[PDB]
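Friendly challenge for the regulars: who can give me the structure tokens for this chain first? No prize, just bragging rights.
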Amino acid sequence: ATCDLLSGTGINHSACAAHCLLRGNRGGYCNGKAVCVCRN
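First reply, four minutes later:
Bragging rights claimed.
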């Protein structure tokens, strides 16, 4: 996964923890600079 893809004028913040939660995670976010990491 990775941020800055669906739209530039709309940074992806929740989308991360969203697909993450459903993936069976505990959360996730655009860290580093433009990488949607996750975490259980």
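The CA atoms of residues 18 and 38 lie 10 Å apart. The chain is about 30% helix and 25% strand. Your move, everyone else.
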